[PDB]
Design a binder for this molecule. Structure first.
Ligand SMILES: Cc1cccc(-n2nc(C(=O)O)cc2-c2ccc(OCc3ccc(-c4ccc(C(=O)O)o4)cc3)cc2)c1
Length: 123
């Protein structure tokens, strides 16, 4: 409906990144999904997601959720709620947000556009 950015958990990305809040169940929009190079291991998908205010490109899908991508329920523009996630920190200090459980609330086709004008979150 009207006021589209009101559909997303504005501020959730900062909360995840600045506070390390892990109990929230934020509603985010998928902006993009891309496979990452794994080779011989099952594919892994990296997601660029939006909370309406920020985007963040450091989301990774748990392997168990691969069929959502492969069968196309989880795709660019869809709106989803993250029911479980974990943050992992790499040796170089970058952090990855692993999506363990997610629900697609509205299909890419039913949403159809990037919501609002989110700006890239920087670290
Ligand atoms: C900083 C950042 C954020 C998101 C993705 C990347 N990335 N981009 C590329 C690439 O070359 O495209 C490759 C990677 C990348 C980065 C880190 C990686 O390893 C970390 C990592 C990945 C997954 C898991 C994990 C825990 C539980 C599960 C599961 O259930 O599947 O998966 C735990 C740690 C794996 C891939 C980097």
């Amino acid at each position: 409906g009207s006021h589209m950015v009101g559909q997303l958990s504005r501020g959730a990305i900062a909360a995840i990144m600045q506070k390390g809040d892990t109990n929230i169940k934020p509603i985010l929009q998928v902006i993009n999904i891309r496979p990452i190079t794994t080779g011989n291991s099952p594919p892994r998908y990296r997601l660029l997601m939006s909370d309406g205010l920020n985007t963040l490109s450091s989301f990774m899908l748990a392997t168990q959720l691969n069929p959502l991508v492969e069968e196309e329920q989880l795709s660019s523009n869809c709106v989803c709620q993250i029911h479980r996630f974990i943050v992992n920190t790499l040796k170089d200090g970058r952090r990855v947000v692993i999506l363990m459980e997610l629900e697609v609330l509205k299909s890419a086709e039913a949403v159809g556009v990037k919501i609002g004008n989110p700006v890239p979150y920087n670290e």
